[PDB]
Amino acid sequence: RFASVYAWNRKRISNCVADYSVLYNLAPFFTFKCYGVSPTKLNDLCFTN
Amino acid sequence: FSRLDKVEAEVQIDRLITGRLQSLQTYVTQQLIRAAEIRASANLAATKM
Structure with missing residues (x-):
């Protein structure tokens, strides 16, 4: 189950x-x-948090 | 380039290409103006020699 939007x-x-x-x-x-990023690049990056 | 795709990244690069090339045109103009002032002094130094 998901959260309510608030x-x-x-x-x-x-x-x-x-x-x-x-x-x-x-x-x-x-x-x-x-x-702020291309979908085509998401698998090649790395992220801080 | 590690973050955008060629069909939309190039607009970000195009601004920078413009702004950097504009900064060289500023430098080369400022050098041509100072170099004319040094010449004006070299032809004075040559006249005093």
Whole structure:
């Protein structure tokens, strides 16, 4: 179950490897929109937090 | 380049190419003006010699 929009959840993802490709193959989640990075680059970066 | 895609990254680079090339055009103009003032002094030094 998800949060109500005023009670919205927030979780630290840390000290792990993050893969977009395996999610997209899993995904009925048929949308995307990025704002400071290209979608085509998300698998090649690394992130602070 | 480690963050955007070629069809939208190039607008960020194009501003920087402009601004950096503009800064060289400032430097080369300022050097041409100072160099004319040093010449004016070299032709004076040559006249005193």
